[model samples]
Target: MIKLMVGSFAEKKLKRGVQLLSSRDYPNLNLDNQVVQLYSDADIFLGTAYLSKQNKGVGWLISPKKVSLNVTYFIKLFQWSKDKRKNFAHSKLTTAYRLFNQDGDSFGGVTIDCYGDFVLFSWYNSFVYQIRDEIVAAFRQVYPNFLGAYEKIRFNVSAHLYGQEAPEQFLILENGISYNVFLNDGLMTGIFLDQRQVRNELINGSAAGKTVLNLFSYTAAFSVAAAMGGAMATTSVDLAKRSRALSLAHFEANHLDMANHQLVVMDVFDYFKYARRHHLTYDIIIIDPPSFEVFSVSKDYHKLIRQGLEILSENGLIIASTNAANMTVSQFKKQIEKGFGKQKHTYLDLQQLPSDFAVNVQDESSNYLKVFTIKV
Candidate 1:
């Protein structure tokens, strides 16, 4: 009877949340380095990549459907001699470029970003490690000039996926702009490299000295990029204080002054309400949230988008994103229409990013990152 009270379900949800928070097993829920023994229906032999090896190395052991750039393109270091190329491991090496589905839980399992000579990888699905050794060997054969290799840095060691430890700093640069990530002690590593182009577009399109608001800010990657583009002030809001802190660190790493940035740790709805009451209007607003969150506030994606648009400036643009494989850019456009009406705004063709960084090859709808603009 007590559990059946009006607030019972919501209260139970809170209890379960606490349970997960207090559980020791929560940290191990999403492991990074489990080995997978892959096989092929073909009568021929395939190679394998082991969990222990790093860089481009994999075997015929039925290469995964997906491969990070570290092994796919950057592993030319082995300089596979003619004799070496003839070796079974070298010849059968397959780049697992699209093994799992991106835009969902599997998206972050094998993320990589290349900055000059540096490469960082996000650990997920321990089973992929089964073929790690062969893959690393292949990397040695591919690109030999890559600089120091490092495991992605997480905020907490126990919370990190794949048993890898956290890094002291987590930041990267591409085309002169700095990007940061938010691990949030969840299954995913901090940032997604596939969105590099999209984030850059946001930064370049943003006006100098304009105020920017980043919703679902995570580690504030977009904020850093916006600030680098000469934004006067930026605000990053997330559910956790630590996520904001990481964003602050990201700006600090870029040598930007904190005076230009604001970190708010609160529910997106609460922040939206506060901004509404205060009549805050931003020049640029980025609203990219997870498809599903444990909190009830995050369940309605359209609500969040509508609330964000309510407080936007006349000339501002909203970079809205949803990774729900079942949802699409068209669907999001329709949702926006339903909320704001078709007469008020015009929708443009949503852009898709490079698929090589995508973990899911089978689902086109999973990577639902898009933008819509309006002017007064």
Candidate 2:
């Protein structure tokens, strides 16, 4: 394995879910002998830092099995998740959850999620990917039957498992909801387990007699949840036409009738204009963009919220959420305030990253998933 050096701040970085280190974070091998080593025994490594050296800079990330920084590390990480998980309500619907979240759980650049009996290993660094076997083996030590571990590589021009094949699709439950998640099929697994908290507290059984509009609705997971919650009607909008079929699968998986639900295949801006011109409105509007793209969380949120106001029913809610890695909690809140400029609005309740996804205050990335509660 190729070894690299980390600086003194390495400990601080390791305290977060995942740490990003650059060329400068390393100490000179020729001088001082002051070193920060990310121990690993792997052959293949893949991460954003390793792929992008165009700026003449180098970088690296760490993980438990590969950069245990040792085998004893997995037990502690697994225990951290179980200790917190035992406090929460677990059922057929809430069986899937985050098992290991990078550094906060003693690993970095890699996250493990439990989806029923199988575990999904999402690797964000090359070293973790190279030591894929070790990670699975260590994971097996905790739950020997979790042998169906699958991988999702968060690198290259995509973020799905490649170089191998797996089952096309399977059924998974989340908080009394059912979805057919696809593994190694495409960019997303038909559902994002990270949103379990949001769905449980906000969408599930809370849409009775209300209408919901889900923007950038991938596979219409939110819409399905709303419908299951007895929503009067729901609209799922996305730029990709394929989203229609994928979304239909979820509805069918849950035996939800589509009579009151509509799927719109159009740009978000165009849909906004169309809904405005058509005199359409919704009781609740959900704005969960594509993490960083679609809308830049720093600059474009207010614009989206402004348009949302045009179609939101009186005192209605606009679930403004972002998974952007760079923005902080206050920054996102500030964007929401900017969106309601001049118009008085209330900051309603919330849907935050639950205890399952451990976060450190020092690093913003660890708390990337920010779901704001807003009313106008």
Candidate 3:
């Protein structure tokens, strides 16, 4: 049996026993005077932390466990995320960042994101709802002036945990690109924060002076970035007219003329077939589709890549990606190569979500996004 002494934050002992998660005993006698302490009677500790020279810690647990929640632990977690947020203050635009990114963030089953002043908490299990009060209390301790706080559980269900609404719509910047985010909207808030790095790469390296075709262009975020990157022209294709409207709002927010880009409300495959018949081609193409669809059938990536290559210009780039957890990055690579048949491409690079979005590098299951930049 071990006891965690949370340094100065400890007062009354917790009634619930601390659930042992993993051991990470600190070495060195100098660790005794650290700002936070986790003492265990057994020869084991629970988590790891990034300690500054002053010994203030950003506590992180490598694995998922239902450890007894202590005030000190919550405070330490908030402090760590807050420090990371400050590190991005010098960024060119108002950034949307993950405050606690599920497993990758040292916490399991819960994802907390900060989109400017608004914060959203998305949970996988209802276990999080039980600790709702404590979670909000800890959040207040960290950000008293936060504009709003919202919660989302499985099945895309959501509710207001703090403020009533999130200002209907707001703007968030990623690497100098702007997009409109809706809080009252459905499951998806607008942009996928995990693909931040990939979007940056597309804006700077692939989209410059290129004519881009963005398939499955939800909200046209990539198209907006492409236009911002000085793409000669961009065409965003999606099935939903609502999505087309949202994409146009993104362009309007950035003050970019809509005439410079085209938003087409049509199925991506249908558009591809139509473009192929007309002998139309593009310098850059992006295909990032949903993992699965509940109502309509899903597009086969292998076939999509095969047909996509047919319309690609010589030396053109294809920025392809997926979020299907069952698909391994290596397997996805094979799918693309197989689709290309005997044709060869300069496999430029593969990308995954940023470090903040990953919990364990060894655990590829958590790193589900696979992106590839290929030139034919």
TM-score sort, best first: 2, 3, 1
User: lDDT by residue for model 2 over 1-376, one digit each (tens)?
Assistant: 3344334454345334345554454445332211134532242222222222211123334342333324555565666666666644355557677877764564556687776666677766555566566556666777665536667777542333322334577777887778777765554677887788777754556777899999999888888888888889999999998898889998999888799999999999999999999999999999988872366778888888989998999979888888876778888888888878889888876565666776654454566788877777
* Winner on lDDT (1 vs 3): 3
**Per-residue lDDT for 1-376 in model 1, tens only?**
0011112332232232211111122222232233333223332222222222222111111133333334543243224221232332232221111212212222232443333334344443343344444544554345444454444332133232222333445555543555554333443445655566666665675547788898888777778778877888888899977786677676777788888788888889899999999998897777777644243222466676678778888866666665554456667666666556433654433655544444233334335555554342
Tell how far residue 22 is off in model 3, in angstroms: 16
Candidate 1, residue 71: how far the Cα is off, in Å: 12
* Best-fitting candidate, scored by TM-score: 2
Global lDDT scores for all candidate models:
0.50, 0.69, 0.69
lDDT of 3 by residue, 1-376 (tens): 2234433221112112211112232323243211233443442443332122211222223222335566656676777766766656446564687777654555555678878878888755444555557766887798777788887764247777786477778898888878899765667788888888887876785688889999888888899888877898998888888887789888898899877699899887799899988998999889888653322212367877888998989989998888766677888887888779999788889898776574454445567788899988
Check candidate 2 and list the clashing pairs: 45-126, 46-126, 93-174, 93-175, 93-176, 102-107, 103-107
Better of 2 and 3 by TM-score: 2
Q: What is the lDDT for 259 in model 3?
A: 74
Question: What TM-score, over all chains together, does every model reach?
Answer: 0.60, 0.80, 0.79
lDDT of 2 at 15: 36
Of 1 and 2, which scores higher on lDDT?
2
lDDT of 2: 0.69
List clash counts for every candidate, in order. 52, 7, 3
